[PDB]
Nucleic acid binder design. Structure first.
Ligand SMILES: Nc1ncnc2[nH]cnc12
Ligand SMILES: Nc1ncnc2[nH]cnc12
Lengths: 216, 217
DNA sequence: GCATAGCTGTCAGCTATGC
DNA sequence: GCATAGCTGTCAGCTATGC
């Protein structure tokens, strides 16, 4: 339900904010950890406190093994209009050429504590995270966690967009039935997203490199 | 696909070990955490390293709004056949009455590091875990993680049984097509399992308490 | 014989459905 | 208008289905 278009010299994306179990989830990110939000029941703050509210998007890039879906389309569209240039892609390919390690290589561990809870010993499951933040507010998270349907752990890439960066302003009120917000995607966000996939896993890198070399 | 029966003075559970996406999964311990295992492709060690392979079972207790399913049935049969006494249940109910805090009350946090990865800053997501290990080999884990289909995080209770405690011994070979192992359940495992739910969350406690009370009558 | 479709943890928000 | 059924992140192991 993510619609990517090109309006007024900008790559525009329209995101649904009422599907808490989709790949596009509204979360209140405080203390670093994302917490679910009932957009249809809880009215958003009207203060400057709207900065704590992000849109967690596990962005796609492949469909029918063709690489013309969401991120891949955004990149293609950006390339078509001369926003993303040859040198921009050449940088990314040069960047991927030097990548030897990935987040997926990092391991999950269970650490012990001296705390107890009614006879039970307290431990901590520790999952590795790679994260880059953009000055405009958006940040990109690469999180190692279990696959939703498959077996094992993968690097998950999330694009997190603060609600202060989208329109209309959700401040002071509640999300409407099937409400969709509009978001102008900066080109720098795409490059860092591509970098994020490149360092996520060797498999992701090979896909991105293949895709980028196909449009040079 | 988890059958529970009473045989020869013991509670016996038969577990399928070729469904790695079910609530019964075979995992190999590694740095404290479990790693998935393709039982149909892996020749289990004939060595003494088989004690590092366990059966992760996200055990159930409710169905159709009635508590006669897996764990709940196990408890009923144990009490009916005089393996779980009234004093055992009082001891558990008294224990539940003294619980004011739960694992679900603990918080998830994202810690920072001084480590990087090609410009990206490395962080660590830390989820709380409550664990209890029986001297027999089995251990029980209570893990705060996201719900599979629902929204948000909740306490997950897993029963971890080492393969060295079940029959037959899979040492040396790979698993068979739809192979099922047999495991006799200790009372202490049943008792500590109930405590786990009791401290997992306030909702689980009310379930266990209502269940145990219905048994006495 | 051989390739793969199609199912696959104890659960909550939202809305199309059915009336 | 209202109560609720039934859908719901980018993916792998296993085995019955298809041929
Ligand atoms: N094993 C389990 N883990 C988490 N929640 C549960 N509810 C019932 N059984 C459970
Ligand atoms: N956003 C994403 N996160 C993880 N894996 C992916 N594969 C394709 N898109 C992905």
């Amino acid at each position: 339900e993510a619609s990517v278009s090109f309006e007024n010299g900008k790559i525009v994306v329209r995101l649904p904010i009422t599907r808490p179990t989709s790949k596009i989830r509204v979360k209140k990110i405080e203390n670093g950890v994302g917490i679910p939000v009932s957009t249809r029941k809880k009215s958003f703050p009207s203060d400057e406190n709207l900065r704590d509210y992000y849109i967690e998007w596990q962005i796609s890039y492949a469909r029918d093994g063709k690489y013309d879906y969401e991120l891949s389309r955004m990149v293609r569209l950006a390339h078509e209009h001369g926003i993303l240039t040859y040198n921009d892609i050449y940088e990314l390919l040069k960047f991927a050429d030097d990548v030897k390690s990935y987040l997926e290589d990092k391991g999950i561990r269970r650490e012990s504590t001296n705390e107890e809870l009614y006879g039970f010993n307290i431990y901590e499951d520790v999952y590795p995270v790679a994260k880059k933040e953009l000055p405009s507010g958006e940040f990109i998270g690469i999180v190692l966690k279990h696959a939703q349907r498959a077996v094992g752990y993968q690097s998950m890439v999330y694009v997190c967009i603060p609600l202060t960066n989208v329109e209309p302003s959700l401040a002071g009120r509640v999300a409407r039935r099937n409400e969709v917000v509009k978001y102008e995607v900066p080109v720098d966000l795409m490059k860092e997203l591509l970098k994020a996939f490149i360092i996520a896993s060797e498999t992701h890198k090979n896909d991105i490199v293949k895709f980028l070399r196909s449009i040079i």
